Curated annotation (Swiss-Prot):
Keywords: Cell projection, cGMP, Cytoplasm, Cytoplasmic vesicle, Cytoskeleton, Membrane, Sensory transduction, Vision. It comes from Mus musculus (Mouse). It is a peripheral membrane protein. It comes from the Eukaryota. Its main location: cytoplasm. This is Retinal rod rhodopsin-sensitive cGMP 3',5'-cyclic phosphodiesterase subunit delta. It is found in: Cytoplasm, Cytosol; Cytoplasmic vesicle membrane; Cytoplasm, Cytoskeleton, Cilium basal body. GO terms for cellular component: cell projection; cytoplasmic vesicle; cytoplasmic vesicle membrane; cytoskeleton; cytosol.
Amino acid sequence: RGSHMSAKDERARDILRGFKLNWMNLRDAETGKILWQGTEDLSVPGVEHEARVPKKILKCKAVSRELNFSSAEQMEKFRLEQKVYFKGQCLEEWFFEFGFVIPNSTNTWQSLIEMMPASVLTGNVIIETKFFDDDLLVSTSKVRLFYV
């Protein structure tokens, strides 16, 4: 009976406690047309988040994403790994690295993200996001997408 807590376990939890995704948007990477804006803290694990995006986003060759996030804790190499799941099948693997995060900072992060109809995809796509500081997994979050 009992458990172990490491310094890395403490740090992971402390980063997550101090971390908040404040807002996020998606634009058509070519035209710059704003497709979706959201304010849900998608860093929160355990729960299933939801996002309702317009059907027209599927016609985009590439999407520009902008994230605004706050962090109480310092991070050396803040990064995201993302998986696009369709009915549990991983369609795409993405990798984004921000780098150093100043303690008690608010930061902005822009990323470029490059067949099935909206009627099939809607409610069946899950984006899983893993938040790291280098080796350290801080959070795993899930967002179910609806194409509306």
